[PDB]
Amino acid sequence: GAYKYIQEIWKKKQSDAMHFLLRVRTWEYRQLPVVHRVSKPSRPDKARRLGYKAIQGFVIYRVRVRRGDRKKRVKKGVHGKPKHQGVHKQKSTRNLKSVAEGKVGKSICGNLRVLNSYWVGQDAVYKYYEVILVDPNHNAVRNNPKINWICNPHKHRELRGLTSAGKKYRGLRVKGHLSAKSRPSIRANWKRRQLIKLRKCR
Amino acid sequence: VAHNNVLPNVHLHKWWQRHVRVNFSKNIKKKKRRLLREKRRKANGGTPIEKLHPIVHCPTQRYNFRTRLGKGFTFEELKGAGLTPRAAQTIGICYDKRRKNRSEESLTKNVERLLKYKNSLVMIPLKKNKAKKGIGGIPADADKNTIKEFRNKKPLLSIFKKEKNTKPFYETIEVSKIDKEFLAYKTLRRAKLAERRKNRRQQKKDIKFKS
Amino acid sequence: LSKLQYHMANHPNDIAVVVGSITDDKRLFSLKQLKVCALRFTETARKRIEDAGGECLTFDQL
Amino acid sequence: ATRFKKNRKKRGHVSAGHGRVGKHRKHPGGRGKAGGLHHMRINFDKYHPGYFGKVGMRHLNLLKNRTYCPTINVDKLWGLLPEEKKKEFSENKDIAPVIDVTRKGYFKVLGNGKLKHNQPIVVKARYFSSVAEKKIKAVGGQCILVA
Amino acid sequence: AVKLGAGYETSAESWGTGRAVARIPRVPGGGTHRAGQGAFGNMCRGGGMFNPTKIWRRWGRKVNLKEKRYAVCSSIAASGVTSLVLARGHRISHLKEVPLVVSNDIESLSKTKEAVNFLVSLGLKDEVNRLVKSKKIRAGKGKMRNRKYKIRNGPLIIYENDNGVKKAFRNIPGVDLCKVTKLNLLKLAPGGSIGRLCIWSESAF
Amino acid sequence: GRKSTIKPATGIAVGFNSGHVVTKRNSKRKELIKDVVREITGFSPYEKRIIELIKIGTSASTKRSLKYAKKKLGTHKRGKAKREEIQKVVILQRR
RNA sequence: GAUGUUAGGAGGGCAAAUCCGCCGAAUUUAAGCAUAUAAUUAAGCGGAAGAAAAGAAAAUAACUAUGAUUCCUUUAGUAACGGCGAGUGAACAAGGACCAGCUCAAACGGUUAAUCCUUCGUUUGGUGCAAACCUUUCGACGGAAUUGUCGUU
RNA sequence: UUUUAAUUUAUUCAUUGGAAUUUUUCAUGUCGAGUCGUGUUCUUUGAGAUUGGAGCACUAAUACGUGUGAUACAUUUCACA
RNA sequence: ACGGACCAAGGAGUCUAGCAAAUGUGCAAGUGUAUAUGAUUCUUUAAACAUUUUACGCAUAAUUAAUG
C-alpha cells in the first residue's frame, strides 16, 4: 500500500513538508529549459495509476506552460461590432493542461504519442506538467498483448483532443442531460440536428 | 404578411443548401441489407442469427400496460435457469448487469421463457463426434442422428419474436355481484387530498426505522 | 344514422333521400327498419342497416 | 404541371400580372413579420389579437409523457364493444359487460352522452368524472378503479 | 440536375457607371476574347440559366393504398368486356369470349415457336402481325439517348406458377408477363388507358 | 409520491404508494493509515485557525468558525462535515 | 544529465469529399440600430482512417420501471430562450436498423520477477519453379526490471 | 480464380496444466486529487439566482460517502449510478 | 421627355418547406401505412406487390396561470 500512502501524503499539498518540497522542486524546475526529458517518474503513484509502465518503450517529459489567458489576436484596436470589441478579458477553450502535451507532441517529438499528464507542481506564472509518451516502435510494446493498441495508427491524440484533458474540455466527461449535445462531438451533433432529411415519395 | 393566414414559422433563415440531403437509395439500401444479412446467416452453418431477448414492461405512465423486448436478462433468471452468464452468452442468450428483477411475475415469466428456449435447443457437436455433457448448464451435446434429421427442417422463430398480448376487453360478470356503494369520484378525490399528510407519516416511519 | 332515424321517427312508412353519403354512428344503440337512398355508404353502416332489416336503395332504384 | 400555372396566361402583358403603376418590388412591406407594433399592427390587432405579451407561470421541462390521458365520453362505451355482443347483453337481464378501457387504449371516462335505461355496465378506467359516475350508477352500473 | 456552381465560377465585377455600357457584370483581364464580355448571369452567353434545377425536387408522389387497390380492381375488371378491349386497340375480333383463359398446361410451355403457334391458333394472328410490324425507330432526340425503338403493347399473359412461361413468352415483341400476386397497374393499364387483352390460366383465374 | 416498502400498493392509480398490485421482494487499515499520515503531515494553515477558533469554546466562536470554514471551502455540507470532524478530533486530543 | 557520420528504427511533405480540435468574422435581418440574427458558419492553422468520433452510465425516469454507443420515423416547431420583437430551439419515452463487450489501477503471490527484450544461434512442418512467406521452441551473451513486469479477481 | 459451410473419420497410451458449477469457512477488502466543488470573470447553450467549457482564488470528503432527481436556500428521506 | 443603326440566336413569376382556401377522388369516427420488415420481383425493377388480434401524427372535448 506504499502507493496508497504516497497518494495520501500528496493529497494534502499544504503540509509543511509538502509545501517545502513543492517549493524546492519548482525552483529547480524553473532554471531548467521549457521542455525536456526526465529519466524516471516524478510521481510514480499518479503515473502508474494512469497508463504508465516500467517497460522499455516509455518516456516521460517535463514541460512548462505560461499561466493566464491568451488575449485576442487582432492588431492594436480590432474592427467589428460592439459585441466583440473587448480583447483583454477573452478566454480560450483548450485547457492549459491540454496545451502542455500539445507543446511536446506537436513537432519536437513526432515519433511518439501522448497518453496523459499529471500535476507535478505550480508557480506564479509558469505552470508545470509531466506528459507521458510511449514509443510505438520498440518491439516490447508491439509484442505486448496490452497497450499495443496505441501502435495501431491514430497519431497526435493531443491535436484531436483524445486524451483525458481532451475529454474533459470537450464536454465528453459528463453524460446525460447535463451535456446532451456534445456526445457525438459538438459539430457532428449540430450538423445532425439542423440537417434536414427529405424522401423520394414525400 | 397578407391578411388571414397563419403567422409564418419557417426555420430556413440560415444556410440550408449546405445541408439538404434527400434519400434516393432507400429501396436499394434495403436490398443491400437483405443480401448482407442473408449471407451472414448462410455462412453461419444454419444457426439462426437472431438472439433471444427478455420481455419487460415499458416505463412511464403512458406505456405502463405493454410488454416489449429489452436487452438481456439479469443474473437471477439465469441462475434459476441454471446458466452462468459467461457460458450463456455463447449460445444466443443476452445478459447484462444493469437490470435488477423487481416483480415476481416478470421473474416467473422470464424464467419460463428461458427454460422453454433451453429445452428447445438441439446442440451441435463441437469437435466432430466428441459429444460430452457440457458445462455451465448448457444443454447436452446431441449425437449424429438427431442433428442429421433436424438440420433439414425449418428453424422456428416465434420464440425469437416478441409475444402477443391477451387483452380480454370483453368480459362479463353477474349483476348480483355488483357493489353499488363504491363512489369512485369520492375515492379519487380523497386519495388526492390525503396525499401530503401520509407522506409525512411515511417520512416519520423512515426516520424512526433509521435507528 | 342517429339523425336519420330521429328525423324519420315522425312517419315510419316513407323513404329518405340524402344526396351525400351516410355515416355509421357508434353512439347509437339500436336501429329500427329504416329505408334510405344515398350515394355512398360505409361497410359498418351497410352491415348495421342490413341487420336492422331495411335495404340500401341506390338512385337508379329510386 | 407547369402550363396550368396562372403565369402562362400573361406572357404578352408587360406587367406579368403584378401591376404597372405600383410595380413589383422585392419585399415591399419588410422581410418576415417585421411590421409588428409599427406599421403592420392593424393586421395583427384584427386577426391575431392575443399574439403579443406573455401570460402565465413557467413549466420548466413539461415532459408531456406524464399527463397524457385520452378521453372517452360515456355514451360511446356500448359502441366500443361489437354489436352482436351488444345484442346478447341487451337480450339477457343477468349478464353485464366489463370494459377495461386500458386494453383499447383509453384512460379517462367523461360524462357526455345518454346511456340505455335499466342496464348495468362495469367500467374500469384510470380516472372518472363525477357526472359520469352519477350516470353510471343511476342505471345500476358500477365504476371500478384500476391502475 | 445541373452543376451547383453553374457558370458562377468566374469573377464578380460590374464596373458599369461611366464606361457607357450595360450594367451587367463583366470579367477582368485582357488579350483574351473573354475580357470585356458579359459575365455570368441568366442573360448572356455561358452565364448559366436562372433557376438551377436542384436535385431535391418533388420527383415521386405518395399514392393512397386504398386508391391503388381500387384502381387495380377497376383495371382488371375493365378487361372483362369486349367493347373496351376493342376500343383500346387490341385486335381480338377472332376470339370467342374476352375473359379468355387457358388450362394450366400453358404454364408448362417451353419453346417460343410453340408459344407463337399457340397464340396464333387462338386467332391472334392479326395481333401478332401488328406487333411484329410496329417495330420502328421513334422520332426526336430520344433515339440518341439509348431509347431507340418504340414498340407497342400486346396481350398480357397471367400465370400462377412459372414452369417455362417467364422464359417462353418474352422475345415476342410487345408481350410481357406478370405473376398474379405481384400484378402491377403499370403493366395492367399502360398509358392510363382502359382495359387490356389478358390471357389467364386456370389456377390464376 | 413516496413508495411504501411494505403494505403492497393499492389499486388506486393516484395517491400515496399508487401503482399496480404486483408482488414486491427484498475496519483496521484505515485508522492506521490515517494516524500515520496525520503524524507525517500535520494540520493545514486554516486547520490551525479552525482548531483555535473551536478551542475558544463560545457560541460566537462556533458561529464564526462555521462561517470561516464555509467561506473558505465552499458549500454548506462539506463545511459542516469539516466542523464536526475537527471538533471531534480536538475533543479527542484534549482528552 | 552531457558527448557521439556509435548499431538498430521513427517524424517532416503531398492529397480532403466525408471526419477530428482551435481560432474566428462580417454581408444580412430586425424594414433604422447597439442585445439578438447570420453562426458555435465562411476564411486560417493543425491531424487520421476506409470509415472516423462516440461508446460500457457518477444514465433516464418516478412508473407493474428501462438499461452501452451510433443512426432512421416520432416526441416537435413542443417545454423553453429571447429590445418576450424579429427570431431561435431541445432532451425522455415510443417503433426500427445493428447489436460484443472488456482491462488498466487497487487486493492477493517473496522457500523467490512465477518476467520482457536486443543480438547471435537450434529446429517444427508447409502452400510456392525460383524468389519470398506462413507456421516452429531449446537456448548463449547482454541487458531492462523491485522508483514494480507477470500471474488473479 | 479468393473464401465458407455441411459433407470423410477417426483409433491408441500418458503426463502436465487450467476453467465452470457445486457444498464448508475466513473478512467485509479495494475502488483514480489542485481533482470535484464554491466564488468571480468571459464565452457558449433551449438552461432560465449560470448548461458546458475555460482563466484566477480557496480547496475537499472515503462508500453510513458524493453526484444526479432542470429555481436559489437550511433540516431530513427515498430512487439511481 | 428617356432607350432603340440593322439583323439571327439566347433572355425573365421558377423550385422547395409550411399553412390556408377552392376544386376532384378514396375512405369515414377513423384515417395515413413511417422508419422498417418478406419475396423462386430482382434487363426494364432506384417499382409494384404484401404488413399475426393499441407505434405514432392529425380528429374524436373544452377550458384555466395552475394543482387540475
Give one DSSP letter per residue of D79-110, joined into a string: HHS-HHHHHHHHH-SSEEEEEEHHHHT--EEE
Which is nearest to F15 in space by CA: D110, D127, D132? D127
What residues of A are in contact with residue F30 (Cβ under 8 Å)? none
Q: Scanning every residue of chain B, which has its alpha carbon at the shortest distance from the alpha carbon of E56?
A: B22
A197 and chain E: CB distance < 8 Å anywhere?
A: no
Contact E24, E36 (CB under 8 A): no
| Dist CA E98 CA F94 (whole Å) | 117
Cell matching residue F47: 486547520
* Disruptive mutation site among E4, E8, E51, E56 for chain B (greatest number of B CBs within 10 Å): E56
The CA distances from residue B176 to B183, D77, D116, D120, in Å, are: 18, 21, 19, 10
The CA distances from residue B171 to A52, C8, D140, F13, in Å, are: 70, 35, 17, 22
Contact C51, C33 (CB under 8 A): no
Contact B127, B133 (CB under 8 A): no
Positions on chain H within 7 A of a protein C-beta: 4-7, 9-11, 19-22, 28-39, 41-43, 45-48, 51-56, 58-63, 66-71, 73-81
Does strand G come within 7 Å of the CB of B94?
yes
Specify the resolution in Å: 4.1
Contact E1, E55 (CB under 8 A): yes
Determine the length of chain E: 205
| Dist CA C51 CA C49 (whole Å) | 5
Q: Scanning every residue of chain B, which has its alpha carbon at the shortest distance from the alpha carbon of E54?
A: B17
| Dist CA C19 CA C7 (whole Å) | 16
Cβ separation F12–D145 shorter than 8 A? yes
Cell matching residue B56: 419487460
D95 beta partners: B174
Which is nearest to A67 in space by CA: A123, A26, A119, A25? A123
Which is nearest to A167 in space by CA: A186, A151, A149, A153? A186
Cell matching residue E99: 375473359
Which is nearest to D32 in space by CA: B13, B14, A196? B13
**What is the 8-class DSSP label of residue A113?**
E
Find cell 470537450 and name the residue: A170
Which is nearest to E130 in space by CA: E177, E89, E179, E178? E89
Q: What are phi and psi of A37, to 5 degrees?
A: -100, 140
Number of H helices and E strands in chain E, helices first, is 5, 4
Strand order in the sheet with C56-57: C16-17, C36-37, C56-57
> Alpha helix (H) ranges present in E15-140?
65-78, 82-88, 112-119, 125-133
Contact D40, B1 (CB under 8 A): yes
Sign of CA dihedral B91, B94, B100, B106: negative
Contact E141, E199 (CB under 8 A): no
Neighbour count for residue B121 (Cβ, 10 Å): 13
Q: Scanning every residue of chain B, which has its alpha carbon at the shortest distance from the alpha carbon of F10?
A: B191
Which is nearest to F23 in space by CA: B105, B107, B73, B80? B105
By CB neighbour count within 10 A (0-12 exposed, 13-18 middle, 19+ buried), where does B200 fall?
Answer: exposed
What residues of B are in contact with residue D92 (Cβ under 8 Å)? none
Q: What are phi and psi of B52, to 5 degrees?
A: -70, 145
Contact D48, B7 (CB under 8 A): yes
Helix, coil or strand: residue A183: coil
Instruction: State, as a whole number of angstroms, the distance between the CA of B11 and the C1' of G84.
Output: 19
CB contact set of D108 (below 8 Å; sequence gap of 6+): D69, D70, D71, D72, D125, D126, D127, D128, D129
* Disruptive mutation site among E55, E57, E62, E65 for chain A (greatest number of A CBs within 10 Å): E62
Contact F54, F62 (CB under 8 A): yes
Pairing, β E156-159 against β E177-179: parallel
| Dist CA B172 CA B160 (whole Å) | 34
Which is nearest to F28 in space by CA: A1, A9, A49? A1
| Dist CA D143 CA B185 (whole Å) | 9
In single-letter form, the type of residue at position E77 comes to: A
Solved by what technique?
Answer: cryo-EM
The CA distances from residue A52 to A41, A47, A102, in Å, are: 9, 5, 19
| Dist CA A64 CA A76 (whole Å) | 28
What residues of B are in contact with residue D95 (Cβ under 8 Å)? 172-175
Query: E24: alpha, beta or left, given left = phi > 0 and alpha = psi -120 to 50?
Result: beta
Instruction: State, as a whole number of angstroms, the distance between the CA of A138 and the C1' of G121.
Output: 22
CB contact set of C45 (below 8 Å; sequence gap of 6+): C1, C22, C23, C24
| Dist CA B89 CA B177 (whole Å) | 51
Contact D69, D107 (CB under 8 A): yes
